[PDB]
Amino acid sequence: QAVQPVDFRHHHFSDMEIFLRRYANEYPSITRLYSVGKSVELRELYVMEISDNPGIHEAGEPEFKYIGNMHGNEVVGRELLLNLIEYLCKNFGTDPEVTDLVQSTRIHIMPSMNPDGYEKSQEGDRGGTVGRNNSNNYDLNRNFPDQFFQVTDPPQPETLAVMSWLKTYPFVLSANLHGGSLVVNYPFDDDEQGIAIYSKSPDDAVFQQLALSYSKENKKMYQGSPCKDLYPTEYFPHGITNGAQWYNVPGGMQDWNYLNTNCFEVTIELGCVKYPKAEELPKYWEQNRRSLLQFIKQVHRGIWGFVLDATDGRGILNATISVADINHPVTTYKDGDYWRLLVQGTYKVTASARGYDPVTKTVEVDSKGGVQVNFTLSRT
Ligand SMILES: *[C@@H]1O[C@H](CO)[C@@H](O[C@@H]2O[C@H](CO)[C@@H](O[C@@H]3O[C@H](CO)[C@@H](O)[C@H](O)[C@@H]3O)[C@H](O)[C@H]2NC(C)=O)[C@H](O)[C@H]1NC(C)=O
Ligand SMILES: *[C@H]1O[C@H](CO)[C@@H](O[C@@H]2O[C@H](CO)[C@@H](O)[C@H](O)[C@H]2NC(C)=O)[C@H](O)[C@H]1NC(C)=O
Ligand SMILES: N=C(N)NCCS[C@@H](CC(=O)O)C(=O)O
Ligand SMILES: *[C@@H]1O[C@H](CO)[C@@H](O)[C@H](O)[C@H]1NC(C)=O
Ligand SMILES: [Zn+2]
Missing domain, CATH: 2.60.40.1120 (Carboxypeptidase-like, regulatory domain)
Incomplete structure (x- = not known):
């Protein structure tokens, strides 16, 4: 009975800006569109705050956040978050689940952390790297200070803006979205030895439950096989995986969150095809809606x-x-x-x-x- 999204298609920056402004203008009572900085190519790093008290932190009210498109060519996350902006705005008031959600949580949604990279991306790209890095050709998910490896790449404007943003609000739970696989990835992403082994964090227990809360709702992800013919070596029991065990990744935004703030962040891989054709978009929403929704609720546990x-x-x-x-x-x-x-x-x-x-x-x-x-x- 809830109203599903209708705007299913790829949104290049201009249209995403138009899209975001539309909801901020139509639902001013429960939204607040703001920028946290600009990209190398001067594009706004837009964030959509959604709650019945936009612009203010209410005492005892949890701050949640979703981030997508950190890697330009991994588009599914960007669209799903736009789909989510729509779903939440259109259902507030009429849908009991969305109403209760928006009232008890302050939700911050950043559709694209690397809008410049996106623009350089080619629709249809399944596993390439064109548009992945930022305008200065640096991997934003290798750009954060790491606890083991000593990061050398120069801190990028998107990275800096986001670090600042993470210091700005009392974020409790979070998830940044990617493409190139199907699984929910949790801390730590790397280890002292810099190899693919399990790298346990003090909160390994919660992270597994948090990650499972999402993968359990995505039927295909839960099955554990991302894409048997593309990456035949990948098998993730119950659709979750410790970052490091999958493979070592230093300088990730995910661990930086946990280690430098109170926020617990997880990394979600929405599917093996990085930049699917627009005709596939509605299916991704259908397969992740419940997941996106259930995950946000974990912030209240x-x-x-x-x-x-x-x-x-x-x-x-x-x-x-x-x-x-x-x-x-x-x-x-x-x-x-x-x-x-x-x-x-x-x-x-x-x-x-x-x-x-x-x-x-x-x-x-x-x-x-x-x-x-x-x-x-x-x-x-
Ligand atoms: C996207 O940006 C990342 C950087 O954030 C690029 O990765 C970097 O690529 C360079 C060149 O391959 C790597 O340097 C080389 O390292 C090897 C291994 O020690 C060394 O033998 C070479 O002499 C050279 O120094 C660098 O390690 C690597 N850095 C990271 C963080 O991965 C990546 O190439 C960019 N993507 C594209 C498509 O340009
Ligand atoms: C512990 O402290 C909080 C913070 O004050 C209490 O919450 C307040 O409760 C009273 C009465 O219910 C309200 O008038 C205040 O407005 C509440 N403050 C808030 C929620 O901002 C809480 O009730 C106290 N006891 C516990 C453990 O719940
Ligand atoms: N910790 C590991 N091994 N993986 C976490 C996903 S981020 C990864 C995959 C992606 O880009 O989607 C990356 O940094 O490229
Ligand atoms: C906040 O608390 C930490 C310890 O948890 C302390 O190191 C830091 O200096 C404090 N910040 C302030 C209020 O200066
Ligand atoms: Zn990625």
Whole structure:
């Protein structure tokens, strides 16, 4: 009964800009179109914010984000996110799922992180590299500071704009879209040895559940065989894979997220054909709609709440949330609010902060959703 997208076709920059503006102009109450910077060839890195309170962070409200077309010729992601912009705007108010989603989450959608590369891409290209890098011929997904390999390529304008953007909002969950395979890729993307081996992150548990939440809804992806005749060597149990194990990739945007912010980012491969003919687009939406939707909901799982000041009674900014045996702490935002993605289990969470006395609580996360837990810390 929900309204499906109708605008199925490839959108070159000009038309994407026209497209985005259309929704921002037609649904001003639940949208906010903004730019986070420009590409080498001066194209806007547009982001579409969608929520019932566009332009403001609401205390306790999770910041989510989708990013596509980081590699110019991997187009499916770009179109799906445009399809998603449409689906969300057109269904808000009439569709209970979309309404409830847009009201409880602040969704940021960037259709193309490499618009210059896109323009240099050839429709029909299945596995080529023309249009992949940015205007200066650098791989944006090799451009981020890496925890193991020492990155040499000069930081590009698209990379910088995005790093800034990631520092701007309290992003909790994220996913950047690619093409060239069919699987959801999770951290870490590389290892100290720089080879194809499993590279576990402190949050390996959640990442597998987060990745599975998407692949499970994409029937063909879940089957585990991206394209038996094109890349016969590829087999991903249940449609997910640790980055490094598939193959070593240093300088990725995915790991940079986890290691430099509170955001947990996953990389999604939407299909073996990088730049399919426009006639195939509607099928990709049909096969990923439920996935795109279910993934966003994962942002509401785990634990969340506030770290307040016993005297003031108001949130503490930049407080820390440490969990049982997971060496990856999370920080609080301006209203002392935090979100910590965790798998079903029991944890010993500890809120702490400069100038206050730490509190520890035994929290319990279930298989269904998120539990609210606040921490009131006394001063020192
Ligand atoms: C897209 O941009 C990336 C850079 O971000 C290009 O990859 C880089 O390609 C150069 C040339 O192949 C590589 O340098 C060479 O490395 C080998 C291996 O050590 C060395 O023997 C050569 O003397 C030379 O230094 C470089 O390693 C590689 N960098 C990365 C991050 O992969 C890529 O070629 C670009 N794509 C296209 C189609 O131009
Ligand atoms: C823990 O702290 C939060 C932050 O104040 C509490 O949320 C407030 O709840 C009261 C009463 O329900 C409201 O008047 C405030 O507007 C809420 N603040 C928000 C959501 O911004 C929360 O109820 C407290 N207790 C827990 C653990 O839920
Ligand atoms: N960590 C690994 N091995 N893969 C993650 C997907 S990014 C990869 C594939 C893509 O470009 O789509 C790339 O950087 O080229
Ligand atoms: C925020 O907290 C971190 C520790 O988690 C600290 O290193 C950093 O300096 C703090 N930022 C501020 C408020 O200066
Ligand atoms: Zn890619």
